[PDB]
Design a protein around this ligand. Sequence first.
Ligand SMILES: [Mg+2]
Ligand SMILES: [Zn+2]
Ligand SMILES: [Zn+2]
Lengths: 90, 1339, 98
Amino acid sequence: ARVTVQDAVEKIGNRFDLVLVAARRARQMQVGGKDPLVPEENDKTTVIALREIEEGLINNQILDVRERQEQQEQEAAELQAVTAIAEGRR
Amino acid sequence: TEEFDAIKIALASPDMIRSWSFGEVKKPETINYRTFKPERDGLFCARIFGPVKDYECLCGKYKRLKHRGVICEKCGVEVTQTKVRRERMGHIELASPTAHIWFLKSLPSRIGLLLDMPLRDIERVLYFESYVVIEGGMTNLERQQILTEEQYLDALEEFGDEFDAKMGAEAIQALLKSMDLEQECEQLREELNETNSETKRKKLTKRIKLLEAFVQSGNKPEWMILTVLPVLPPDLRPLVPLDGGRFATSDLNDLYRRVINRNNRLKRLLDLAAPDIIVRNEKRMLQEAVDALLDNGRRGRAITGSNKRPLKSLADMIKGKQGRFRQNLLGKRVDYSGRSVITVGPYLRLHQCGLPKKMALELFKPFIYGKLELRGLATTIKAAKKMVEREEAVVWDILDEVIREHPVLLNRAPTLHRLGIQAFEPVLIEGKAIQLHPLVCAAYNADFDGDQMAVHVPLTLEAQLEARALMMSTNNILSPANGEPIIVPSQDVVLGLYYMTRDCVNAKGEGMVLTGPKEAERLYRSGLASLHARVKVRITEYEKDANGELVAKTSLKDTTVGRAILWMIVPKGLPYSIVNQALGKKAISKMLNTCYRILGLKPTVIFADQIMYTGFAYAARSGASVGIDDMVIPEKKHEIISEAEAEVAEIQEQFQSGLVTAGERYNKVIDIWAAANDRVSKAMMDNLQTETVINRDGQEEKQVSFNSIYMMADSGARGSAAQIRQLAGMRGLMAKPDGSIIETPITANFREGLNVLQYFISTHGARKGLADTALKTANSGYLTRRLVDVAQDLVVTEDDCGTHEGIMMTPVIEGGDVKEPLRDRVLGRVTAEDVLKPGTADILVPRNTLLHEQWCDLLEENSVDAVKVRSVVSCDTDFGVCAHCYGRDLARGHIINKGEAIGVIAAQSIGEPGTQLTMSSIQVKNKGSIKLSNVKSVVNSSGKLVITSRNTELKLIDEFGRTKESYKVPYGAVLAKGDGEQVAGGETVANWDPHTMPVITEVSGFVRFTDMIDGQTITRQTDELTGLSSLVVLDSAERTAGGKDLRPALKIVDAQGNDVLIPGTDMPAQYFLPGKAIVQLEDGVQISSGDTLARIPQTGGLPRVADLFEARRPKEPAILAEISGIVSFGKETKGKRRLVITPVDGSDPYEEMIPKWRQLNVFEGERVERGDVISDGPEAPHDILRLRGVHAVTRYIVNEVQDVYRLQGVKINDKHIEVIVRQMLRKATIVNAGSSDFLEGEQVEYSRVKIANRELEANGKVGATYSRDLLGITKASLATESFISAASFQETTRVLTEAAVAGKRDELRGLKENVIVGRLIPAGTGYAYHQDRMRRRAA
Amino acid sequence: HARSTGSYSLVTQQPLGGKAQFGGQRFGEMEVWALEAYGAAYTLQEMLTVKSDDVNGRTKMYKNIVDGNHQMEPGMPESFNVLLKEIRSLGINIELED
DNA sequence: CCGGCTCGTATAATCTTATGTGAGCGGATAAC
DNA sequence: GTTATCCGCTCACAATGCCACACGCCTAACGAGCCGG
Ligand SMILES: [Mg+2]
Ligand SMILES: [Zn+2]
Ligand SMILES: [Zn+2]
């Protein structure tokens, strides 16, 4: 479980970037199906999101870098699928 | 729809109404109810509005989903959903045109202001009593001339076919479009350029601003009169289903039935060539019926059968406490909620609460359904419903998986301040009540007397995460109103900790020696040594003066077993001298506060928990009861009352002989009963506090007692000296409700019995206090409502405005003690300028830093008296407040983040403690430097010091330079000392006469009489019992007409009889004489340097704060000085007395009037600087603003409101009152026209003027000149650009009329508008939303 | 007294009040001032729109919870459209731009 | 054998312990 | 004289929030119905 919040507000900027960044991380962890970095302790996604914030492995720059990287890999992989279709046609 | 910007409003055209509607209602009957099909072309219908059931014709032809769109012909009904029944309007085509009731009777009459015609004339035109003339032409008569039947008949004799005169609504409709719009504007602009009279210019600027706004809109003067009236979609005024027979009707349906019946009857009367009298009467009936439909209040007439209440018109569905702004668009009822009674439960931690098991199964039903269908234990939703209605044993494990990290909001009903709702985690309880952690209970201000609380559930992902971060109860320690912890341990924990840490001089194990604190615990448990027996122990303590780490130190200290036990829960940081004292309430409060300062957040929370646990444990092991032998009566009460009775009998006999009057008899009796009450109270307190004598192992000693109620008062748990005084000593003096205070005080206490009369007397004060509370609640609620209406649209929006203005703070001193020091006021506000060290040209503070606490001490050490600091009222940012202009935030630590909605928390911090409110010589006291400010004095012949300056001020200073004390030294008084004369305390340094105004001279010689004639001006009055006959000089008005035109004057001459000039100038100061001027040293009598020539005789509760924030004008204000110059009286009784003040270089056009009844201060040869008092009394802040600048009204408001809050011990920080002052002076008038398009008399918000001047100054044009206004808070709310934010507040009707005429357009910026619409707020999290949207719009 | 999902009123699509009629609590005006006084933004949006007066929003939310996905759909409250339809019943044009 | 009775239902009428504001408008009011 | 002000009279508009509970929300006479005397 988790009681305090003040280990994150001194890591991310204020008490308002923390809400949006941790909500975005928990939303892509819950439904998008990604595996968490630190191990769970049978907690919910909000608490494990705040834990990954306060240790310092999830940040807004880091979220946009990872999303850009995996999305570029996604469009590159479907371009590879299109070139595989082009190999299969001719 | 979605994705929509600003809301637009304008009038509604008849062709727009025909674009809206979907059919014409013709029949006034609702439904047949033989069968319950609706009647065709009734108020309800199916061909007009929509289908009765879903996807079905009324005829009952097409019943299938794959037939959508094609209408029937059996019923003419489009097969669509019944939601269409909620959204299609209807129209009625009227027989006669009809005047709208709002535009007639908004009272500024829009028709009357438009046509330049009084309202009562238009009223007796519309209600068929007169005629108007419409283009009379070759006629004696004019246009707007109105007639009666007799002038109309005589005109029909005279000009029988020339004039065109009608009546009723058609006549006004004819006059409206017959008028042009451009010609009226240009003609009246030329007439205003040809006009100097003021009131005419007021009315004409109103009329041309009306016309210019009316043309710059889209609309027309035809549209104020109705022709086609629309009706509401009939699901939105539904017909009430009763049980047995008929259906109960609404109010709107009865009003529409009445209108349609009247309309059909008039249409048939027009169809049959009716005579003129009957159609006039019928048109009057229809006009009155539409006036009854739109707003029933202007003619309070429409009342129904068996219930003689006014029916609810359409305007009554918007205003009030039940219309759609206050009722349904702000406070909506909310699913996933619950209510219970509460209960303590002292085993909880701070971040959790007790939740009933059954109610928690009831709340979280969809989460349960999802967890069941995840784990394969069900397949459908109905299987899950059966499983959770059987309450099988798997469901409780599932519910415990649902709870675990999912917080819950709790609420208490009369929410005052923002700690009212807080979020906890749940702990399941087999019970039926909600358990609640006891430290939080002071923040809710909750009883356990039956107080009920409520529960809401955050259910999305962002709401869970906000309730964990922003709102969990471990994140609210300090209060937002003032930086003090709100987690003070309450009454019972106070009693426990106070009983643990004391001492008594002989107990078990006294004077032994110990190893740790844990050995002292092991001695307490075994019963070997008692809890408080003095003992030397060994303690290790850690001190973090090393820069980021801990230093151990081990010593032996003389302390107590209980103090060694309490030391085991103190964390590493604090020194041992925090738990060595007796530890009452304020001591443990500052214990928590120092633990917060030194260590952080998490040890503060866990330390408050350990304090609460051990305080309850040792309060249990105390056994502190109360009994009837714990209230010690004094032994000396009886003879004190006997001596008081002897003294009142002696005063009664001195009144009976006739020596002393009745008022002094009253005063002597009340003084001696006050003294007797004080002596009895002193005796009982001295008998309680120290009676406990105990054997030392020598003879005897004295100590503080272990009595029960003395521990309950001395610890500060419950009670004061007053309540424990009424329990054993006699009780006070009860005051009768007339306002007087009764002769005989209540001689008895509560331990003895009260007899009949004394209890009957005490009932007065009981019922008075109860009624005062009962009304005080409502007044505080209304004032809080208005303040949070004012300050809502204000958000900290950018970082650094970067200016170099501000205010100067000095610690406030009344003349008694220094009330607020410089440390408490200017803790945590960003410095304006670099305040220099007293060592000159040494930068003590940089000009743009934050006064934190250590820095505040290092500013305090050099004894700084005035610090300049940045306020909010001079912050530069348009549409918000910069961050460094507001400083650090309360309730947290650092500077404030961009978005904190500070106006709302400020209005809550002022309005929260409003329930707690209610509804001849200068004597120095200490030794220091004696400074006199604005002093200009001279020593007379007799050694006294008379001052020739009014504004002299006394400053007692220390050796440093800081002000110790201050007083006000009057003009020309009896001064025991001079300037700079180093004297000591206890000294009466001044005196004057409150019945003698100084008419002191400037030179020596004689005083001669110019125009002072006995019988014309002056009178010779002989004091009949002394022998010194003197002269009495009145003013011009009090004497008769023989000296009305004469001006009596004591001409200041020498002993020769000639005017000696003033040293410094060349002006002879002859002394013209005001009224009640007793001239003693007459002509031929030598005078001195400044000698007395003529002797001249002369709220606080919550409505004070209410009448101050309204800024309403006080009665008989203080006349100030407009600009400096020589004073000169003038003509008498042209209404008032005239006065001309001539500048040194400029002209003197202003010739101010003064009621000669009210007194005056200045003299003729005297000249004063601008903004200076003339007649004493109260002050309106308007004058203070327009004369002494902008910061002066802020200082006046802050000091007065802060006096009213310091009277009751309520501590509210100043920046909240500053940011309420900023929202009061936001409008502005314009003095010139400027180079831009702004008119002269144009009231306009300041920030638009400022950006206009910034844009013009970017080029090389000239700007405009503005005078900053100051409005009341209700006037500032009611005049806002957003016409929604003024519609939700009071008087929605007038705001909607003015906004609909002007055709405004509301951008939807601010908090209240976006709450109404229902998107994200632009304040908290969602602020980061809106500017992310805003850069999307501009790019 | 408690409620997860109960009945609704006729004119405005709000839940009813009281214990007997299976109602929800009045999250009144002063509590909205209190949530504005924090930095709470999304929670005010649920207490204003998803919990009441957005019909399609609340049924989408209920299905979305049972499916196990915590999203939300903002929408627009039906009571505001009620307010528009009885201002248009007077002679006052009022629309929404864009 | 139409409405006298009897009913379905659509729709008209002779207070009187309050306060405090502001805001406007009609009647007196003091000048070249 | 006539004009620009001052003052008294009259009238619209506001007055906390929540809870439970409980009982109330037409009819003498104008268009139809039945069938007796
Ligand atoms: Mg209570
Ligand atoms: Zn049909
Ligand atoms: Zn600023």
